[PDB]
């Protein structure tokens, strides 16, 4: 179903393709299996760490798709790993055994597909997490309009600052992960404008509060400047969301 992945997932899943191509051959192509107790112990250690980290994410996540789609993959990896462990124990008796062989093939296949499914499910939840932050900043930008005091401006700026920092970090990490260079350009340029307009917003709000209280002219020019900055910043954040949605959109709709 998914054609493109991030530069990270493509690199992690690059060797996996050839691994599966070899594992799928085994059923068609003497015996003597060399021990395999130590390499299987490493898989169990690796699998348990992945399932642990995975289960921590499912427990701490806000995402219902993740909470639903991730746990079946742990089971798929755990069942396949117990097959590798079961296989290693019957090879202790005699390395020349056909039932132990089938358990090794289905074990490795079941782990590889399971971890690739787990990774894709996780990255899909991550892009959703980035879209939620962006939308959150959008909503908080609409609040600038009610700020009419120095106390509220401090409150506002101290609430907006971390969100802007969280979003900027997310977008820098994300753009560096994309394979479409023109998509990266759209995200960097949009995030550049937001980063550049953020002190402009504060300056405009500061002029508005100082003119409001106190007193009179020019509240219209200050208002105009604040509203424009919010509108331009909002249009750019929406540009970021839309680029991220072009890529990530899944069924239905």
């Amino acid at each position: 179903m998914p054609v493109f992945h991030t530069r990270t997932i493509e690199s992690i899943l690059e060797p996996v393709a050839q691994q599966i191509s070899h594992l799928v051959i085994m059923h068609e192509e003497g015996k003597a299996i060399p021990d395999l107790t130590a390499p299987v112990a490493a898989v169990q250690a690796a699998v348990s760490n992945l399932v642990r980290v995975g289960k921590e994410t499912v427990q701490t996540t806000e995402d219902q798709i993740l909470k639903r789609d991730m746990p079946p993959a742990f089971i798929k990896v755990e069942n396949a790993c117990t097959k590798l462990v079961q296989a290693a124990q019957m090879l202790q008796s005699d390395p020349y055994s056909v039932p132990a062989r089938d358990y090794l093939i289905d074990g490795s296949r079941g782990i590889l597909s399971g971890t690739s499914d787990l990774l894709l499910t996780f990255d899909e939840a991550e892009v959703r997490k980035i879209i939620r932050v962006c939308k959150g900043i959008l909503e908080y930008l609409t609040v600038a309009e009610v700020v009419e005091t120095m106390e509220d401006l401090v409150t506002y700026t101290k609430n907006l600052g971390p969100g802007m920092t969280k979003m900027a970090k997310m977008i820098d990490e994300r753009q560096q992960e994309l394979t479409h260079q023109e998509h990266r350009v759209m995200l960097v340029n949009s995030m550049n404008t937001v980063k550049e307009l953020l002190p402009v917003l504060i300056s405009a709000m500061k002029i508005f509060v100082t003119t409001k209280n106190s007193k009179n002219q020019g509240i219209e020019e200050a208002l105009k400047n604040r509203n424009f900055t919010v509108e331009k910043m909002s249009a750019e954040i929406n540009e970021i969301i839309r680029v991220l949605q072009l890529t990530s959109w899944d069924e239905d709709a």
């Binding site: 990270t8 997932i9 992690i12 060797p15 996996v16 691994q19 070899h22 594992l23 085994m26 299996i33 060399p34 395999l36 390499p39 299987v40 490493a42 898989v43 250690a45 690796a46 699998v47 760490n49 992945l50 980290v53 995975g54 994410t57 990896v77 590798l84 062989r101 090794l104 093939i105 074990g107 490795s108 782990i111 590889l112 971890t115 787990l118 990774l119 996780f122």
Partner: peptide, 23 residues
């Protein structure tokens, strides 16, 4: 990158089990 690194170590641990089947 904890899940990504944990997944990477799993794929790496399965590699010696493959070459053992392939002889």
């Amino acid at each position: 990158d904890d899940i990504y690194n944990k997944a990477r170590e799993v794929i790496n641990a399965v590699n010696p089990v493959i070459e053992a089947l392939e002889k």
